[PDB]
Amino acid sequence: GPGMSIDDYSLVHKNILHSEDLLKYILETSAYPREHEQLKGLREVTEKHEWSMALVPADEGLFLSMLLKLMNAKRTIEIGVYTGYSLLTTALALPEDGKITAIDVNKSYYEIGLPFIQKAGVEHKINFIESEALPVLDQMLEEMKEEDLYDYAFVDADKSNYANYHERLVKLVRIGGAILYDNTLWYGSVAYPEYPGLHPEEEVARLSFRNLNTFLAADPRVEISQVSIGDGVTICRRLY
Amino acid sequence: SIDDYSLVHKNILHSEDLLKYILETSAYPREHEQLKGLREVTEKHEWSMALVPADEGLFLSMLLKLMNAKRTIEIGVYTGYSLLTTALALPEDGKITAIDVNKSYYEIGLPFIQKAGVEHKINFIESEALPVLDQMLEEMKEEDLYDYAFVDADKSNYANYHERLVKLVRIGGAILYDNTLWYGSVAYPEYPGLHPEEEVARLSFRNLNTFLAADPRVEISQVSIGDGVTICRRLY
Numbered sequence: 001g002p003g004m005s006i007d008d009y010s011l012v013h014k015n016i017l018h019s020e021d022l023l024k025y026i027l028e029t030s031a032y033p034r035e036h037e038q039l040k041g042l043r044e045v046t047e048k049h050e051w052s053m054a055l056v057p058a059d060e061g062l063f064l065s066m067l068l069k070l071m072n073a074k075r076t077i078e079i080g081v082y083t084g085y086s087l088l089t090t091a092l093a094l095p096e097d098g099k100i101t102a103i104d105v106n107k108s109y110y111e112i113g114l115p116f117i118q119k120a121g122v123e124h125k126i127n128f129i130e131s132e133a134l135p136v137l138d139q140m141l142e143e144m145k146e147e148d149l150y151d152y153a154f155v156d157a158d159k160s161n162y163a164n165y166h167e168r169l170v171k172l173v174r175i176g177g178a179i180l181y182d183n184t185l186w187y188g189s190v191a192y193p194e195y196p197g198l199h200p201e202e203e204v205a206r207l208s209f210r211n212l213n214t215f216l217a218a219d220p221r222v223e224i225s226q227v228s229i230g231d232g233v234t235i236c237r238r239l240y
Numbered sequence: 241s242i243d244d245y246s247l248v249h250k251n252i253l254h255s256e257d258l259l260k261y262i263l264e265t266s267a268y269p270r271e272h273e274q275l276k277g278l279r280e281v282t283e284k285h286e287w288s289m290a291l292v293p294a295d296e297g298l299f300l301s302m303l304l305k306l307m308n309a310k311r312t313i314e315i316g317v318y319t320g321y322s323l324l325t326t327a328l329a330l331p332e333d334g335k336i337t338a339i340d341v342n343k344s345y346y347e348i349g350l351p352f353i354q355k356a357g358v359e360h361k362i363n364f365i366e367s368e369a370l371p372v373l374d375q376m377l378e379e380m381k382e383e384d385l386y387d388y389a390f391v392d393a394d395k396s397n398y399a400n401y402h403e404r405l406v407k408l409v410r411i412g413g414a415i416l417y418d419n420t421l422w423y424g425s426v427a428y429p430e431y432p433g434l435h436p437e438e439e440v441a442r443l444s445f446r447n448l449n450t451f452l453a454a455d456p457r458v459e460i461s462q463v464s465i466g467d468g469v470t471i472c473r474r475l476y
C-alpha cells in the first residue's frame with residue numbers, strides 16, 4: 001500500500017454502490033456543498049497523488065464529522081493519516097480545545113495536506129507522530145491513565161494489522177467510546193470466501209477483513225455497526 | 241404478495257450478495273431475539289417493503305448510544321422495527337414518543353416489544369404526525385426537547401415534518417430522515433416505470449436532499465445505508 005506497489009491493487013475502479021451515478025449524486029448533492037474549502041483543496045491535490053485510491057471520500061468524511069459531533073468527542077486518535085483528509089475532518093469537527101494523536105509511518109504524505117490543515121486554523125489540535133502505529137499504541141497502553149482515555153479512534157492504516165490494532169484500542173478508548181475501522185468491505189470483495197485475480201498483498205488485506213468482520217461481530221467487548229458508506233466503515237462502541 | 245410499487249426489490253449496493261454478506265456477517269448475529277422475531281413476521285406482511293433493514297437498525301442503535309440519547313420521537317412506526325431498536329438502545333428510564341396513523345401495524349410487532357421488556361418506554365400516539373407535531377410545538381418546553389427524531393412516515397411530507405422537528409429537537413440533537421436515496425432513483429431527473437405515488441416520493445426526496453444540503457439550521461450527513469439515511473444535527 002502507501003505504507004510498503006500501486007500496481008498490486010486491482011480493484012481501485014470498483015465501488016460498493018450500485019452505480020457511479022448514485023455515488024456522484026450523493027457527493028454533488030450532499031457532500032461537496034458541506035465540505036470545508038480546505039478539505040476540498042486537500043482532496044483535489046490528493047486526487048492527483050499516486051496513492052489517491054487510499055483517500056477517504058467526502059461523503060464518508062461528513063459522516064465521520066457527524067459522529068464526532070453527536071458523541072461530543074474531545075480527545076481522539078487517527079491511525080493512518082495519508083495526506084490528512086480524515087484527520088482534517090476530525091480537527092474541524094472537534095471543539096477548539098480538542099486534541100488529536102495522529103500516527104502514520106510516512107510524514108511526507110502528511111506534509112502534502114499540512115498547508116490546508118494550517119490554513120483551516122486547526123493544526124494546534126494535532127500531535128503528529130511519525131511511526132508504525134503498533135509500538136506507539138503499546139507505549140500508550142503502558143503510560144495511559146483512565147481519565148486520559150480517547151473518545152474516538154479512526155483506524156485506516158496497514159490493512160493486515162487491524163486485528164492487532166483492535167486489541168490495543170479496546171483498552172485505549174473509553175467505555176462508551178468509538179473505534180471506527182475503515183475499508184471493511186474492501187471494494188465488495190469480502191462478500192466471497194474466494195475472489196479471483198488479486199495480487200498477494202491485496203488478497204492478504206481481503207482475508208484480513210473477512211476475519212476481522214467475523215471477529216468483531218463475535219467480540220463481547222464492543223457493540224458494532226458495519227455501515228455501507230465509502231468502502232465500508234465498522235463502528236465499534238466499547239462496552240467494558 | 242406482488243407489490244404495487246416498482247422499486248421495492250432494487251438495491252443501492254452493487255449486488256444482493258454484498259448486502260447478504262453484511263446482514264449475515266454483521267447484522268443478524270447482533271440482532272436482538274425480539275427484533276429477529278418482529279422482522280420475521282413483518283417479512284410476510286403485505287407492506288414488508290417498508291421495513292427498516294437489520295444493518296440500518298444497528299446503525300440507528302449505535303448513533304443513539306454514542307450520543308447518549310434519552311428522549312426520542314419516532315415518526316412512522318409500521319410494525320415497530322426501528323421503534324424496538326430505539327427502545328432497546330435507550331437506558332432503562334428512556335422515553336419515546338411514537339407516532340403512526342395505523343395502530344393495527346403497531347400491534348403486529350407489539351408482542352415482541354413487550355417480550356423485550358421495553359413497552360414502558362413507549363408512548364404510542366395513533367394519528368397523522370403533522371397535527372401531533374403542531375400540538376407539541378405549542379406546549380414543548382426547552383428542557384423537554386428531544387435528543388433524537390427518526391422520520392420514516394409519509395414521504396411527501398418530510399419537508400413539512402422538518403420545519404416542526406428543527407424546533408422540537410434540542411440544539412445538538414439529531415433528526416434522521418429514512419429513505420432519502422429512494423432505491424437510487426433520486427440520482428436522475430427522470431426515472432421510468434414508477435407507480436405514481438413512487439414518483440411523488442422520488443421528486444420529494446430530490447427536493448428535500450437539495451434543501452437539507454443548504455439549510456443553515458443543521459449540519460447533515462447523507463449515509464448510503466439501507467435506502468439512504470440523512471442525519472441532521474441542529475445547530476441553533
Ligand SMILES: Nc1ncnc2c1ncn2[C@@H]1O[C@H](CSCC[C@H](N)C(=O)O)[C@@H](O)[C@H]1O
Nearest residue numbers: 003054055056080082086104105132133157
Ligand atoms: N504500520 C503502519 N503504521 C502507521 N501507518 C501506516 C502503517 N502502514 C501504512 N500506514 C499508513 O496508512 C495510511 C493508509 S491511507 C490513510 C487514508 C486517510 N485516513 C485519509 O483520510 O484519506 C498511509 O498513509 C500509510 O502511510
Ligand SMILES: Nc1ncnc2c1ncn2[C@@H]1O[C@H](CSCC[C@H](N)C(=O)O)[C@@H](O)[C@H]1O
Nearest residue numbers: 290291292316318322340341368369393394
Ligand atoms: N401522515 C402520517 N402520519 C403518521 N404516520 C404515517 C403517515 N402516513 C403514513 N404513515 C405511516 O408511516 C409508516 C411508514 S413505514 C415505517 C417503517 C418503520 N420505521 C420500520 O422500522 O420498519 C407506516 O406505518 C404508515 O402507516
Ligand SMILES: [Mg+2]
Nearest residue numbers: 054156182183
Ligand atoms: Mg481507508
Ligand SMILES: [Mg+2]
Nearest residue numbers: 290392418419
Ligand atoms: Mg423507511
